[PDB]
Design a protein around this nucleic acid. Sequence first.
DNA 1: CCAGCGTGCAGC
DNA 2: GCTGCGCGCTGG
Length: 138
Amino acid sequence: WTPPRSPFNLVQETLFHDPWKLLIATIFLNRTSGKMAIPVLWKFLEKYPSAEVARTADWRDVSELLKPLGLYDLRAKTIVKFSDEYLTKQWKYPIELHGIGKYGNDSYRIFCVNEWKQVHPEAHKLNKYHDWLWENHE
DNA sequence: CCAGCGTGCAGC
DNA sequence: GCTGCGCGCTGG
C-alpha cells in the first residue's frame, strides 16, 4: 500500500512508511496548527529518531521542545509512554496504545495499512483527504 | 482588548 | 459526557 500524494499536503503522506513517526505527528497535531507543530516535529525527530530513543527520553527535555505548541507537559509524558507501549504491547491497531485515539488510529488505517475504505474520519484535513480518496478512487 | 480556535486524548 | 490541558495565532 502506497497512500497517494494529495493537493491537501497532509504530513501523513510522507511519514506512512514509519508508523511511529506518523503516530508521533498525529500527537503533534492534537489541537495544534500544522504550521506550528510540523517544524517542531522535525527537530523532535532529529533529537528522538525512534521509539527506542523516545521511550528512554526525559519528558522535561521533550516538554522544552513542545513549549511553544501548548499541551507541553501532557504530550511530553504521553510521547514517552506512547513510545514505550509502541515497542512493548503486541498491538494490531494503534488505538490500543497510550496517547493514540480515534484520530491517530484513522490516520494509521488510511496511511500505514490498506484499510481507508473501512475508516470514517472526524478530523478536518483527514476527512478532506479521505473524501478525495473515495472520489478519485478508480 | 480579549475570546475563539488548532488534523485530541486520558481519566474520572 | 465532561474536564483539564495550553500556547501562539488570528480577528471584531
